[PDB]
Curated annotation (Swiss-Prot):
Membrane topology of the entry: Multi-pass membrane protein
Full-protein interval shown: 1025 to 1191 of 7096
Catalytic activity: Thiol-dependent hydrolysis of ester, thioester, amide, peptide and isopeptide bonds formed by the C-terminal Gly of ubiquitin (a 76-residue protein attached to proteins as an intracellular targeting signal)
Gene: rep
Stated name of the protein: Papain-like protease nsp3
Record-annotated Macro domain positions: 1-167
Outcome of mutating residue 31 to A: In strain: Mu/B.1.621
Lineage: Viruses, Riboviria, Orthornavirae, Pisuviricota, Pisoniviricetes
Activity regulation remarks: Inhibited in vitro by GRL-0617.
Organism: Severe acute respiratory syndrome coronavirus 2 (2019-nCoV)
Role noted for this protein: Responsible for the cleavages located at the N-terminus of the replicase polyprotein. Participates together with nsp4 in the assembly of virally-induced cytoplasmic double-membrane vesicles necessary for viral replication. Antagonizes innate immune induction of type I interferon by blocking the phosphorylation, dimerization and subsequent nuclear translocation of host IRF3. Also prevents host NF-kappa-B signaling. In addition, PL-PRO possesses a deubiquitinating/deISGylating activity and processes both 'Lys-48'- and 'Lys-63'-linked polyubiquitin chains from cellular substrates.
Location in or out of the cell: Host endoplasmic reticulum membrane
Subunit text: May form homohexamers. Interacts with N protein.
Amino acid sequence: VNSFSGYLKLTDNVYIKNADIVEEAKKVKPTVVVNAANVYLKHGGGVAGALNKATNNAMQVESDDYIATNGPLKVGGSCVLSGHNLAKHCLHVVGPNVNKGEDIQLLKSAYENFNQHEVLLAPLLSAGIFGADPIHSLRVCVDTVRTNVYLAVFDKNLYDKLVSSFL
Ligand SMILES: c1coc(CNc2ncnc3nc[nH]c23)c1
């Protein structure tokens, strides 16, 4: 049993809810929240801008030190940093950005990072400001992630379309 409430069960391991990921993290304080990161960990907008704002910019300060030491992530890659006031850990995952011309085949590699964690609160990778089709992102998630993933989809309209169209 875990603390996640109000989710629709899609599969053995994948759950979904119309919820802003920021407010969900603050309520649950999950072990792992996933950020929709870019390779520079520049948390300007979308999910990343919203979680960084909720940490009062502490996520960005930690991220800048990480990049100064290690250099940029890979598209499809990840790193584990603090969850600050939102979670124990934040898993920063880089899905391909269609609005930068990145290979959508990298979306499966991105979701494979989730398998290193038993339970996660996450957004749909490459959705929102990253330009991919969220229906596709949900299909790759279900077909790639084997650990228990709780998805927070804020756009009520999109949530209803994801559920209605789910095979
Ligand atoms: C209300 C509208 O957006 C938010 C911040 N959370 C958020 N932003 C963007 N994409 C999201 N996906 C889940 N939660 C998200 C709150």
